[PDB]
Design a protein around this ligand. Structure first.
Ligand SMILES: CC(C)CCC[C@@H](C)[C@H]1CC[C@H]2[C@@H]3CC=C4C[C@@H](OC(=O)CCC(=O)O)CC[C@]4(C)[C@H]3CC[C@]12C
Ligand SMILES: CC(C)CCC[C@@H](C)[C@H]1CC[C@H]2[C@@H]3CC=C4C[C@@H](OC(=O)CCC(=O)O)CC[C@]4(C)[C@H]3CC[C@]12C
Ligand SMILES: CC(C)CCC[C@@H](C)[C@H]1CC[C@H]2[C@@H]3CC=C4C[C@@H](OC(=O)CCC(=O)O)CC[C@]4(C)[C@H]3CC[C@]12C
Length: 419
C-alpha cells in the first residue's frame, strides 16, 4: 500500500461551497409553497400553480437523473458543480425579473432552471466525499453535505414568511418584498457560483485514500446503466425498499408543499407560525437522522430498525392528522416535530439498507432509482392531497397519507433480508 496519499485543505472549501449552494437550491424549492397563499393572491392564480412550482423540482429529476450521472462519470466533478451552481444562479436571476402581477410564467421558468440544477446538485455529496476526503472523514463529509440541503429546506420554511408579509391590499409593498427576497437569493447564488468557479477544483493533487488512489489510477471499464437498472429491478427486496422509500419521501414532500394550506385552513394569519412549524419539522428530522445513524452504527440491524421507524412515522402522522384541527398551535408544533423526526430518520436508514441489498451493483444507479421513486411518489401524493384538501379539507389528505404509510409498513414487513 504505497499510494502517496495526502490531505489538502482545499477539500474543506470544496465541501463548504457545495453545502452552501446546495442549501440555496433547497431554499428555492419551498420558498413559494410556504407562503403559497401570498403568491396565489399576487399572481391571481390557483393553489395548484404554486404546488406545481414545488413539483417541477420532482418532475425534472426523473428524466434527467441518469444522463446527469453519465455526464458526472465521464466529464468529472467540476463540470457538474459548475452546471448546478450556474443553473441555480440563472434561475434566481430569472425569478428576480418575475415580480409582477402578470409574470407568473417567468417565475415558473426560473423554478424550472433551479429544478434542472437540483439534478446535478443532489448526487454530488458522495462523489465529493470520496474524491476529496480520507477514509475517516468520508461519512462525516457526506452527512454534512446532505445536512446542508436539509438546512436549506429549513431556511426556506422559515424566511419567506417573515420576508414577505401578507399585505394583499397593498400590491406595491408586496412586490417590493418579493423583489427583495429574490434579489437576496440571486446575490447569494451569484457569489456561490463565483466561488465554485474560482476554487472548486476537479480533484486534489494526490489521492486522499488508498481506495481513491486505486480508483484514480485505473479508469473504470465501460458500464451500462440500463443493465444495472434491470438487474436491480429483478431483486424483489430492493423493489420493496424502493416503494417504501418513495412513499415516505413523497409523503414528506407533500406535507412540505401543502403545509401552508393546511395551517391556514384552521389558523388565520399564521404564516410565520407555519414557517416555524416547518423548520421545527426539518430540524427534528435532522436530529432523528443523526440519532438513527448512530443507532445503526451501534447495532448493524437494518430490517428491525427500519420497520420500527416506519411504524413510529405512521403513528406520528396519525397523531398530527387528528390533532391539526384542535385550534392550538403548540400541539401542531409538537406533532410536526415528532413526525419530521421519524420521517427524516427513516431516509438514511432506508438508503443504507438499499446499498446493503444491492452491494454488487453500483451505488449511483440505486441512488438515482431511490430518488426517482421519491420524486414520483411526491408528485402523486402532492396532487392527491391537494385535491382532497381543496375538496374535503386537510383531514382527507392526511388520512390518505396515513393509509399510504400503513401500506408502506406492510411492504417493509414483507421484505426478506439477512442483513
Ligand atoms: C423543464 C422541466 C422542469 C419540465 C417543466 C414542465 C412545466 C413547464 C409544466 C409541467 C406541468 C405543468 C403544469 C400542469 C398543470 C397546470 C394547471 C393549469 O391550471 C389550469 O389551466 C386551470 C386554472 C384555473 O383553475 O383557472 C395551469 C398550468 C399548470 C400549473 C402547468 C404549468 C406548466 C407545468 C409546470
Ligand atoms: C418504483 C416506482 C415508484 C419508480 C420506478 C421508476 C423507474 C421505472 C424509472 C425512473 C427513471 C427511468 C429511467 C429514465 C431514463 C432512462 C434512460 C434510457 O436510456 C436509453 O434509452 C439508453 C440507455 C443506455 O445507455 O444503455 C433508458 C431507460 C432509463 C434508464 C429509464 C428506465 C426506467 C426508470 C429507471
Ligand atoms: C393505495 C391507495 C390507492 C389508497 C387510496 C385510498 C383512498 C381511496 C382513500 C384514502 C383516504 C380517503 C379519504 C379520507 C377522508 C375523507 C373525508 C370524508 O368526508 C366526508 O364527507 C365524510 C365524513 C365526514 O362527514 O367528515 C369523505 C371521504 C374522504 C375524502 C376519503 C375518500 C377516500 C380516500 C381518499
Amino acid at each position: 500500500p504505497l499510494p502517496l496519499t495526502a490531505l489538502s485543505p482545499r477539500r474543506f472549501v470544496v465541501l463548504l461551497i457545495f453545502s452552501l449552494y446546495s442549501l440555496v437550491n433547497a431554499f428555492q424549492w419551498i420558498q413559494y409553497s410556504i407562503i403559497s397563499n401570498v403568491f396565489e393572491g399576487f399572481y391571481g392564480v390557483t393553489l395548484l400553480h404554486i404546488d406545481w412550482l414545488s413539483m417541477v423540482y420532482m418532475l425534472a429529476y426523473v428524466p434527467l437523473i441518469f444522463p446527469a450521472t453519465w455526464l458526472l462519470d465521464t466529464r468529472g466533478l467540476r463540470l457538474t458543480a459548475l452546471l448546478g451552481s450556474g443553473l441555480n444562479c440563472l434561475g434566481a436571476w430569472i425569478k428576480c425579473g418575475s415580480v409582477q402581477q402578470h409574470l407568473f410564467w417567468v417565475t415558473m421558468l426560473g423554478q424550472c432552471l433551479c429544478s434542472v440544477a437540483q439534478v446535478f446538485i443532489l448526487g454530488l455529496p458522495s462523489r465529493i466525499a470520496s474524491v476529496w476526503f480520507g477514509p475517516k472523514e468520508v461519512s462525516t463529509a457526506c452527512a454534512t453535505a446532505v445536512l446542508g440541503n436539509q438546512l436549506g429546506t429549513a431556511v426556506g420554511f422559515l424566511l419567506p414568511p417573515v420576508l414577505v408579509p401578507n399585505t394583499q391590499n397593498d400590491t406595491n409593498l408586496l412586490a417590493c418584498n418579493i423583489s427583495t427576497m429574490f434579489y437576496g437569493t440571486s446575490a447569494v447564488a451569484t457569489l456561490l457560483f463565483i466561488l465554485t468557479a474560482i476554487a472548486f477544483k476537479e480533484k486534489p493533487r494526490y489521492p486522499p485514500s488508498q481506495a481513491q488512489a486505486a480508483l484514480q489510477d485505473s479508469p473504470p471499464e465501460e458500464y451500462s446503466y440500463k443493465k444495472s437498472i434491470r438487474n436491480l429491478f429483478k431483486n424483489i427486496p430492493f423493489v420493496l425498499l424502493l416503494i417504501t422509500y418513495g412513499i415516505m419521501t413523497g409523503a414528506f414532500y407533500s406535507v412540505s408543499t401543502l403545509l401552508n394550506q393546511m395551517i391556514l385552513t384552521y389558523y388565520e394569519g399564521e404564516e410565520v407560525n407555519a414557517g416555524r412549524i416547518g423548520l421545527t419539522l426539518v430540524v427534528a428530522g435532522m436530529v432523528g437522522s443523526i440519532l438513527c445513524g448512530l443507532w445503526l452504527d451501534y447495532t448493524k440491524t437494518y430490517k428491525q430498525t427500519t420497520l420500527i421507524v416506519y411504524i413510529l412515522s405512521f403513528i406520528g402522522m396519525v397523531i398530527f392528522t387528528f390533532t391539526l384541527d384542535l385550534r392550538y398551535i403548540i400541539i401542531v408544533f409538537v406533532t410536526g416535530g415528532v413526525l419530521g423526526f421519524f420521517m427524516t430518520g427513516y431516509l438514511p436508514l432506508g438508503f443504507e439498507f438499499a446499498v446493503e441489498i444491492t452491494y454488487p451493483e453500483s451505488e449511483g444507479t440505486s441512488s438515482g432509482l431511490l430518488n426517482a421513486s421519491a420524486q414520483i411518489f411526491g408528485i402523486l401524493f402532492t396532487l392527491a392531497q391537494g385535491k382532497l384538501t381543496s375538496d374535503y379539507g386537510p383531514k382527507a389528505g392526511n388520512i390518505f397519507l396515513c393509509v399510504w404509510m400503513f401500506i408502506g409498513i406492510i411492504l417493509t414487513a414483507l421484505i426478506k433480508s439477512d442483513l
